[PDB]
Amino acid sequence: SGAIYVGNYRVVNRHLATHNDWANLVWEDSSRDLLVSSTTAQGCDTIARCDCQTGVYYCSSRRKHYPVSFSKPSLIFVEASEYYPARYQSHLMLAVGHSEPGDCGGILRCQHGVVGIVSTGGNGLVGFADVRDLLWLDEE
Ligand SMILES: COc1ncccc1NC(=O)N1CC[C@H](C(N)=O)C1
Ligand SMILES: [Zn+2]
């Protein structure tokens, strides 16, 4: 589990969105595994607007942050899970790192800010849904 809190937005994995998220919906995209809902309180996270390919992510199944090198956002085939059939997910970045299903939502960040959230993994890989192209998260 986990979210990004930027401005009056809450960014979560679409497959983990709550009823309150759906009832306060701003934007969602199944192909990216992302959903954004509106918040009453202002958040403290800032979004990175950069080209970093190295950063650090939070792994809840280890209670630890790990440094990683990750690929550029791309269209990657993701195995079936209880939430989606086997399919291509867009804007996904892969790295070598530990992950388990419940690790979705952990933040990946660089020196510029938040880059994305854990969205996929297995067998010593971890994948992150990029948010750096979503420029509208910085306004409203
Ligand atoms: C961190 O994810 C994992 N970690 C280990 C094995 C398997 C996984 N993957 C998952 O549980 N899913 C749930 C939905 C998600 C997606 N399609 O974006 C992939
Ligand atoms: Zn950066």
The string of DSSP letters for 7-23 reads TTEEEEEGGG--HHHHH
Q: What angle do CA 46, 17, 29 make, to 5 degrees?
A: 75
Resolution for this model in angstroms, one decimal place? 1.1
110 is in an annotated binding site: yes
Q: Which amino acid is at 138?
A: D
Ligand 1 within 6 A of CB of 120: yes
CA of 139 to the centre of ligand 1 (A): 30
- Contact call for residues 38 and 20 (beta carbons, < 8 A): no
Q: Are 106 and 136 in contact (CB under 8 A)?
A: no
Q: CA 1 to CA 118: how far, in whole Å? A: 9
* Secondary structure of residue 68 in the 3-state scheme: strand
Residue with the smallest CA separation from ligand 1 atom 18 is 119
**DSSP code of residue 91:** E
Closest atom of ligand 1 to 87 CA is 17
Q: Could you identify the residue written with the tokens 């809190």?
A: 5
- Which has the closest alpha carbon to 120: 138, 93, 140, 139? 93
**Method of elucidation:** X-ray
Q: Are 113 and 48 in contact (CB under 8 A)?
A: yes
Give the number of other CB atoms < 10 A from CB of residue 136. 11
8 Å CB contact between 30 and 13? no
Residue boundaries of the structural domains of the chain: 3-44, 45-140
